[PDB]
Amino acid sequence: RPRFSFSIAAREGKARTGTIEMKRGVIRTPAFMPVGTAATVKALKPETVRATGADIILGNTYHLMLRPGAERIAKLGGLHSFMGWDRPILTDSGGYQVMSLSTKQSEEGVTFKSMLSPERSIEIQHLLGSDIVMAFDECTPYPATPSRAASSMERSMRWAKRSRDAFDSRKEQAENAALFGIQQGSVFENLRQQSADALAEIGFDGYAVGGLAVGQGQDEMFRVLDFSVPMLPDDKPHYLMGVGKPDDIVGAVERGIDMFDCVLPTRSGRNGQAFTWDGPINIRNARFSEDLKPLDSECHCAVCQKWSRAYIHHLIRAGEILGAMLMTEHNIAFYQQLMQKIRDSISEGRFSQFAQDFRARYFA
Amino acid sequence: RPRFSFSIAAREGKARTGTIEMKRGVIRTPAFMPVGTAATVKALKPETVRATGADIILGNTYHLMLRPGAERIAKLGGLHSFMGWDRPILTDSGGYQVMSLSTKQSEEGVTFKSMLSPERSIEIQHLLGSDIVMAFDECTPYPATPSRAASSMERSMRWAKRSRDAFDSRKEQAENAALFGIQQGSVFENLRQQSADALAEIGFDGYAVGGLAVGQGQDEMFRVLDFSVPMLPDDKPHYLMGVGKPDDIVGAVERGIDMFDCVLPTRSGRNGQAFTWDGPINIRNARFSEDLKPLDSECHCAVCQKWSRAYIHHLIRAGEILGAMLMTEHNIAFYQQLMQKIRDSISEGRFSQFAQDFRARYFA
Ligand SMILES: NCc1c[nH]c2nc(N)[nH]c(=O)c12
Ligand SMILES: NCc1c[nH]c2nc(N)[nH]c(=O)c12
Ligand SMILES: [Zn+2]
Ligand SMILES: [Zn+2]
């Protein structure tokens, strides 16, 4: 199988749909990656994650390097075997969570309490047996001074080269996995340009848009995507990290994004929030106490085929694990169905109408 | 289909194996009933409960009557449709949990804060659409004075008649469900005899042994079963409520018990305890951190087919829901496999050897 082969099947405006072929499977783009925090997509067996339509999941370097530990997972056969997901896994580099969850920053890297460097990040992702390795970056806090944004980005660009070289010098990794670079630059077009320039110069299999969804509202996120995604190599996937709500996803695909990860469907699922085509609902609301309809009237997921709002309402209010299970399965299924609808509509050259139709109904 | 038809296929000593045919399915005996507290077997989809081999599950009158409420569940189509379990459900009467979880006792019944009477218990079980209805009883605290034990039992026997009559006067219920009487009498052979006498006189589809596992160690529980189960009608099922550990189950079947319910496999599963043929293990123990073997080397369950001790160790220590899910599925599967082994061995007239072999290995 191919290491990493991205093919664009169809375009509409800035939107693209296609496939990333990897050794462990095909990723249909635009893709949503369920996040699997500590070697589990919370409340779901991998077979259920797969059943919802996920082609790839996200693993966290930061969390796994602490618990159970990267050497330990490698000893146990790698993350795929450990958690029983045999399809592609993208691992974040730790760059974001080390600052958000732990800290002393330096040129060599970051030292913390719960040294993570580009090299060590790559190595850990190696030990995990990640299929898509993220370069180790610094997710510039928002907002930030232009000079601040610029030296922050420039360090990440230096760390991107280091990541590239560390990755390349590990033959197994280089032959079997992919490496993505992460664009930073905050909300600054010139810094974003600079960063894309550096990344493209170094060369990556894919390019993420880092440092968004970190304080910027949707309007501002979209404005930054409007100029930032065109700076990335067209012929490589574009990954918007940590985004987002269904409408964030639709608008980002309209701006050229091919890949997404977000904790929202899993986390808000556990918290009672179900996504529906008519917008989110909070299943704990007393209005659902005797509602026999499924979470979503159109959803094809197993939850919606079998259980009512009323039942899931009861479960979540009772703090029952099955409630978290069913809410999560539905929300991830919903997200996957959204992605499918997105892919099909771009394929068919009716994505613009879809986005419009989606938005009308979702916000109504 | 039959309302309630119990057939004994094979005997060995006091042990029996056979089948209870009901409208919603066949129950193979000796049977273990997973407990489904608030309309869910914790951490398991009903399809998974079924996959483990459960033929019937237990529902709680007390919990459901408070949340979401019996009228409400009936309005929503009954407990089976609500929770998506279409096979038999045995509902406890509330007699035990009203005292243990809530209280003022009287002849008419019990009034509490979180009036439950025999009639109201039956009615609620009716609204739930229970297949096996338990008479409303009083689970005599242990230990207790003989006079105390005796008036407690005598009230339950009066409540048993009331339960019988309430059940019978509801034609739908009488035609489609079964009613079990509950023997009390504490640890007193004469009171147990009295109680069996009263129950048999009233007449039930099945007879439970109530008031055990409530302070009595195994030796004492077994001593009480030694004289109490022979007092029950042979031709009806014998249900030991709230029991128990695998070895409790084996010894109780050796004493004539046909049915069991216990929260142990689910609750201790969530708590890190896995049952294995070599005894329970606490998967949180550091010794399992790199153990690639399944929870149990012989277990046929899906968990043991796919995930290692090491992984489940990690999940449970991380407080991950999937950990609770996999631990529970395995433990319920284990219990079901135990019951199957019990049934097969009685069928084959090698149950005595099995019990011996089971015990040797389990306690070793
Ligand atoms: N939303 C921004 C973001 C999410 N995850 C991230 N991971 C990394 N390494 N860098 C980033 O900027 C981000
Ligand atoms: N272990 C005793 C027991 C468990 N569940 C019970 N439910 C009822 N109604 N009565 C009882 O005595 C018991
Ligand atoms: Zn659904
Ligand atoms: Zn197992």
Answer whether A38 sits within 8 Å of B75, measured CB to CB.
no
Confirm or deny that B95 is annotated as ligand binding.
yes
Please state, in angstroms and rounded to a whole number, the distance separating the CA atoms of residues B34 and B44: 10
Per DSSP, the three-state class of A95 is helix
Measured CA to CA in angstroms, residue B173 lies from A143, A303, B160 at distances of 67, 30, 16
Please state, in angstroms and rounded to a whole number, the distance separating the CA atoms of residues A363 and A359: 6
What's the burial of B2, exposed, middle or buried (CB within 10 Å: 0-12/13-18/19+)?
exposed
Give the pairing of strands A110-111 and A104-105: antiparallel
DSSP letter, residue A39: S
Structure-token match 């009230």, residue found: B155
Tokens matching residue B29: 């005996």
List Cβ<8 Å contacts ≥24 apart for A343-346. A343/A17, A343/A28, A343/A29, A343/A30, A345/A12, A346/A10, A346/A11, A346/A12, A346/A15, A346/A16, A346/A17, A346/A30, A346/A253
Question: Closest by alpha carbon to B85, among B123, B39, B126, B23?
Answer: B39
Q: A308 contacts in B (CB within 8 Å)?
A: 76, 82
Please state, in angstroms and rounded to a whole number, the distance separating the CA atoms of residues A332 and A329: 5
Q: Residue A85: what residue type? A: W
Region of B94 on the Ramachandran plot (φ > 0 left; ψ -120 to 50 alpha; else beta): left
Please state, in angstroms and rounded to a whole number, the distance separating the CA atoms of residues B296 and B303: 10
Answer whether B82 sits within 8 Å of A311, measured CB to CB.
yes
Tokens matching residue B154: 């005598």
**Terminal alpha carbon distance of chain A:** 45
Please state, in angstroms and rounded to a whole number, the distance separating the CA atoms of residues A310 and A254: 36
Question: Closest by alpha carbon to A325, among A63, A13, A51, A95?
Answer: A51
- Suggest the residue from B40, B315, B322, B328 to mutate for an interface test with chain A (most A CBs closer than 10 A): B322
Tokens matching residue A145: 């001074």
Half-sphere exposure of B60 (CA within 13 A, CB side): 23
Omega prior to A141 cis, within 30 of 0:
no
Resolution for this PDB entry, in angstroms: 1.6
Q: Residues with Cβ < 8 Å from A175, sequence gap 6 or more?
A: A3
CB under 5 Å of ion ligand 3: residues:
A 299, 301, 303-304, 330
Region of B342 on the Ramachandran plot (φ > 0 left; ψ -120 to 50 alpha; else beta): alpha
- Helix-then-strand count for chain A, H and E: 16, 15
Question: Closest by alpha carbon to B268, among B39, B35, B38?
Answer: B35
Q: Residues, chain B, total?
A: 364
Question: Closest by alpha carbon to B271, among B331, B338, B339?
Answer: B331
User: What does the DSSP assignment read for A108-125?
Assistant: S-EE----B-HHHHHHHH
Question: Closest by alpha carbon to A113, among A98, A95, A131?
Answer: A98
Tell me, using a 6 A CB cutoff, whether residue A92 lines ligand 1. Answer: yes
Q: Residues with Cβ < 8 Å from A219, sequence gap 6 or more?
A: none
Half-sphere exposure of A33 (CA within 13 A, CB side): 28
Number of structural domains found in chain A: 1
Tell me, using a 6 A CB cutoff, whether residue B212 lines ligand 2. Answer: yes
DSSP letter, residue A135: P
Question: Closest by alpha carbon to B308, among A323, A54, A61, A68?
Answer: A68
A215-A216-A218-A222 Cα dihedral, nearest 10 degrees: -140
Q: A301 contacts in B (CB within 8 Å)?
A: none
Question: Closest by alpha carbon to A211, among A133, A337, A99?
Answer: A99
CA of B149 to the centre of ligand 2 (A): 15
Backbone angles phi, psi at A273, to 5 degrees: -90, 120
A318 at the B interface (CB within 8 A)? yes
B33 lies in which domain range? 1-364
Query: SS3 letters for chain B?
Result: CCCEEEEEEEEECCEEEEEEEECCEEEEECEEEEEECCCCCCCCCHHHHHHCCCCCEEEEHHHHHHCCCHHHHHHCCCHHHHHCCCCCEEEECCHHHHHHHCCEECCCCEECCCCECHHHHHHHHHHHCCCEEECCCCCCCCCCCHHHHHHHHHHHHHHHHHHHHHHHCCHHHHHHCEEEEEECCCCCHHHHHHHHHHHHHHCCCEEEECCCCCCCCHHHHHHHHHHHHHHCCCCCCEEECCECCHHHHHHHHHCCCCEEEECHHHHHHHCCEECCCCCCEECCCHHHCCCCCCCCCCCCCHHHHHCCHHHHHHHHHCCCHHHHHHHHHHHHHHHHHHHHHHHHHHHCCCHHHHHHHHHHHHHC
Measured CA to CA in angstroms, residue A362 lies from A34, A245, A279, A346, A347 at distances of 21, 11, 4, 19, 22
Tokens matching residue B250: 């084996």
Q: Residues with Cβ < 8 Å from B189, sequence gap 6 or more?
A: B227, B228
Task: Find the farthest-apart pair of alpha carbons in chain B and give their distance in angstroms, rounded.
Answer: 60
Give the pairing of strands B132-134 and A238-240: unpaired
Work out the angle at residue A146's Cα, subtended by the Cα atoms of residues A144 and A149, and round it to the nearest 5 degrees.
60
Query: SS3 letters for A328-339?
Result: HHHHHHHHHHHH
Å between B277 CA and nearest CA of chain A: 24
Per DSSP, the three-state class of A136 is coil
Confirm or deny that A262 is annotated as ligand binding.
no
A316 at the B interface (CB within 8 A)? no
Q: Residues with Cβ < 8 Å from B41, sequence gap 6 or more?
A: B34, B35, B49, B57, B266, B328, B332
A308 at the B interface (CB within 8 A)? yes
Please state, in angstroms and rounded to a whole number, the distance separating the CA atoms of residues B306 and A109: 38
Please state, in angstroms and rounded to a whole number, the distance separating the CA atoms of residues B104 and B99: 9
What's the burial of A171, exposed, middle or buried (CB within 10 Å: 0-12/13-18/19+)?
exposed
Please state, in angstroms and rounded to a whole number, the distance separating the CA atoms of residues B56 and A188: 63
Å between B230 CA and nearest CA of chain A: 40
Q: Is residue B357 annotated as a catalytic residue, yes or no? A: no
Neighbours of B146 (CB within 10 A): 12
Q: Which atom of ligand 1 is nearest to the CA of A241?
A: 4
Q: Out of A72, A314, A320, name the one closest to residue B42 (CB).
A: A320
Rg of chain A, C-alpha, whole Å: 20
CA of A274 to the centre of ligand 3 (A): 9
Let me know: does B195 contact B183? Beta carbons within 8 Å: yes
Tell me, using a 6 A CB cutoff, whether residue A133 lines ligand 1. Answer: no
Please state, in angstroms and rounded to a whole number, the distance separating the CA atoms of residues B41 and B228: 30
Q: After which residues is chain B broken (C to N over 2.5 A)?
A: 102, 114
Tell me, using a 6 A CB cutoff, whether residue A214 lines ligand 1. Answer: yes
Neighbours of B284 (CB within 10 A): 17
Per DSSP, the three-state class of A211 is coil
Please state, in angstroms and rounded to a whole number, the distance separating the CA atoms of residues B207 and A356: 64
Q: Which atom of ligand 1 is nearest to the CA of A139?
A: 12
B293 at the A interface (CB within 8 A)? no
B36-B39-B42-B47 Cα dihedral, nearest 10 degrees: 90
Half-sphere exposure of B203 (CA within 13 A, CB side): 3
Q: Residues with Cβ < 8 Å from A146, sequence gap 6 or more?
A: A188, A191
Let me know: does A351 contact A15? Beta carbons within 8 Å: yes
Let me know: does A204 contact A179? Beta carbons within 8 Å: yes
Rg of chain B, C-alpha, whole Å: 20
List Cβ<8 Å contacts ≥24 apart for A197-201. A197/A231, A198/A157, A198/A160, A198/A161, A199/A157, A199/A160, A199/A232, A200/A232, A200/A233
Per DSSP, the three-state class of A90 is strand
Answer whether B38 sits within 8 Å of A325, measured CB to CB.
no
Q: Which atom of ligand 2 is nearest to the CA of B135?
A: 9
Tokens matching residue A210: 């880092």
Tokens matching residue A76: 């146990």
Backbone angles phi, psi at A146, to 5 degrees: -55, -45
- What CATH number is associated with residue A154? 3.20.20.105
Neighbours of B22 (CB within 10 A): 25
CA of A291 to the centre of ligand 3 (A): 15
Handedness of CA B148, B154, B159, B160 (dihedral sign): positive
CA of B60 to the centre of ligand 2 (A): 11
Q: How was this structure determined?
A: X-ray
Per DSSP, the three-state class of A13 is coil
Omega prior to B206 cis, within 30 of 0:
no
Please state, in angstroms and rounded to a whole number, the distance separating the CA atoms of residues A101 and A103: 10
Give residue A74's Cα distance to chain centre: 23
Which residue of chain A comes nearest to B304, CA vs CA? A84
Tell me, using a 6 A CB cutoff, whether residue A212 lines ligand 1. Answer: yes
Let me know: does B90 contact B61? Beta carbons within 8 Å: no
Q: Residue A124: what residue type? A: I
Answer whether B38 sits within 8 Å of A308, measured CB to CB.
no
Q: Report the residue among A92, A195, A264 best suited for mutation to probe ligand 1: largest number of ligand atoms under 8 A from its CB.
A: A92
Let me know: does A53 contact A340? Beta carbons within 8 Å: yes
Q: Residue B215: what residue type? A: G
Answer whether B76 sits within 8 Å of A290, measured CB to CB.
yes
Confirm or deny that B93 is annotated as ligand binding.
yes
Q: After which residues is chain A broken (C to N over 2.5 A)?
A: 102, 114
Q: Report the residue among A33, A97, A137, A240 best suited for mutation to probe ligand 1: largest number of ligand atoms under 8 A from its CB.
A: A137
Answer whether B314 sits within 8 Å of A38, measured CB to CB.
yes
Please state, in angstroms and rounded to a whole number, the distance separating the CA atoms of residues B359 and B96: 30
Backbone angles phi, psi at A69, to 5 degrees: 105, 140
Tokens matching residue A279: 């917008």
Å between A124 CA and nearest CA of chain B: 18
Backbone angles phi, psi at A221, to 5 degrees: -60, -40
